[PDB]
Design a protein around this ligand. Structure first.
Ligand SMILES: Cc1ccncc1NC(=O)Cc1cncc(Cl)c1
Ligand SMILES: Cc1ccncc1NC(=O)Cc1cncc(Cl)c1
Lengths: 304, 304
């Protein structure tokens, strides 16, 4: 029992973290096989960031200008290319610590662990969710760029995120490992406002099932609702509309607890309309939306 | 910016996790140098747990009865001894992945990361605090015993906790790495109620400073208080009494923000008396007490 915002064990990612320096800018890189992945803004100076022409900037850069350091050993850069907003630095040595890996572009609402790094060194790990507005509410400071988001399935690390930017609102924007930003963000020091941050309804329901499994049941009511009735409430409270796909993925939680998905929706409806009335659910005084139904199942069963 | 419940990167601990089987009981072990540390209840059967005589049970156990598996390779057990509530299994091979380490007995209020494991395999990592009543509000299921709590200072892992037990209230009790339980708990399947879980006042203040640093300032008021006046409020709200030692450790946060510790105490006093009035602080609708002043400094500066 107990329910925690659990991150994946970061070991497999730690062995991939390197430091990339280009000129006077130092950020993190991800070394997998003989390639180092890093945000292309490593080639920029603070002045360049206002309106960078990355292709023009990359012309003035040679393989020797990219300093890649793994722990304390230097990697020899034998190739460089730009793929969208990431630089792929071909090095002469395959990372001996490269885990089994995939590059995945996650959907909004999906969660992942972040291994926050500075100068190629890991400082901490935390669980995040790709917000519906394609930002992540992370914890990053200057130098954290290049830190990656990932998920792990047994021995395979699915890298899904690379941190690039902090928006003026303190929220974070980044790319998948092909260098494509999540959301409409560009890697430019320009004000880019994020869209409405809606609540990930399916995740809140998944977390409500986790609460029932772990003992917190006060919020269960004598009511039920329909997907349409629930969505009227979800729209008013800036919750993502619930679909039959969401109901389907909540099926294993509904089966374990014996609480129909629409019955749980009615509990969520009442929680939205009446608040928590000073009470808590899994030690939280608000509705947690950064646990997917898969995370709840995984944590509640002990998947390693 | 952004503030997260960050755990230490778990890599150094992952390379120490092994599976220990004694008879039909399998739990986690911590392999450092040529020793494997695990809860002594690994020698128990479910019947034995009701009233175990560990010395009598250990007599019937030989080195060959302890099966220690690291990943998929078997460790040869050349010695066994019981130190308080832990078993130290001397193996013939030093763990090649043993990081620099220390065994530390933490104080209540101090935080640590937990690498939850099942059958010697890590499932996740999360940040915890040793509650003032010496329990931890973790996330553990059957088979998680032997999972360890730790802190990391650059390259040195300070192991502070080993999970042993789940109390009937769903909270967790365990030992330091010398096998001494935190709190009055015994490794017996008997109802052991925990004491009052008070709030770690110094940590809530540290988290309030983290909120100010990151932009959440709505709770700052035009008031101040004294340690004695604050403690009258802290006692009523089952908060730990604040001492001058606590004020001293909040000094670097007070200096960075320019908000005197007693002024922050007055904001906390008002938050206790009036609640949050539907608002949030660092995305939380309650006062977070599982970030020490050291954690706030570390996260807010980027210590790797
Ligand atoms: C200072 C900081 C804090 C947290 N996370 C990231 C950063 N860094 C930046 O945002 C720098 C930057 C500026 N303009 C466009 C890009 Cl691509 C990157
Ligand atoms: C089932 C579970 C869930 C989470 N954490 C731990 C456990 N296991 C136990 O508590 C088993 C146990 C019983 N009596 C005394 C001891 Cl030392 C250990």
């Amino acid at each position: 029992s107990g329910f925690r915002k659990m991150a994946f064990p970061s070991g497999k990612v730690e062995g991939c973290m390197v430091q990339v320096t280009c000129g006077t800018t130092t950020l993190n890189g991800l070394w997998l096989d003989d390639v180092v992945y890093c945000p292309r803004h490593v080639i920029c100076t603070s002045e360049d960031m206002l309106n960078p022409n990355y292709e023009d900037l990359l012309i003035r850069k040679s393989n020797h200008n990219f300093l890649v350091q793994a722990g304390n050993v230097q990697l020899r850069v034998i190739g460089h290319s730009m793929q969208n907003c990431v630089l792929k630095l071909k090095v002469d040595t395959a990372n001996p610590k490269t885990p089994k890996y995939k590059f995945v572009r996650i959907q909004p609402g999906q969660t992942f662990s972040v291994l926050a790094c500075y100068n190629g060194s890991p400082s901490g790990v935390y669980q995040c969710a790709m917000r519906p507005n394609f930002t992540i509410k992370g914890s990053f400071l200057n130098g954290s760029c290049g830190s990656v988001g990932f998920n792990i399935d047994y021995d395979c690390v699915s890298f899904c995120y690379m941190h690039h930017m902090e928006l003026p609102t303190g929220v974070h924007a980044g790319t998948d490992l092909e260098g494509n930003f999540y959301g409409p963000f560009v890697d430019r020091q320009t004000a880019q406002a994020a869209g409405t941050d809606t609540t990930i309804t399916v995740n809140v329901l998944a977390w409500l099932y986790a609460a029932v499994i772990n003992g917190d049941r006060w919020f269960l009511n004598r009511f039920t609702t329909t997907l349409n009735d629930f969505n009227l409430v979800a729209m008013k409270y800036n919750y993502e509309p619930l679909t039959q796909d969401h109901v389907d993925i909540l099926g294993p939680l509904s089966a374990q607890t014996g609480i129909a998905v629409l019955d749980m929706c009615a509990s969520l409806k009442e929680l939205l309309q009446n608040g928590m009335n000073g009470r808590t659910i899994l030690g939280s005084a608000l509705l947690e939306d950064e646990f997917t139904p898969f995370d709840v199942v995984r944590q509640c069963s002990g998947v390693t």
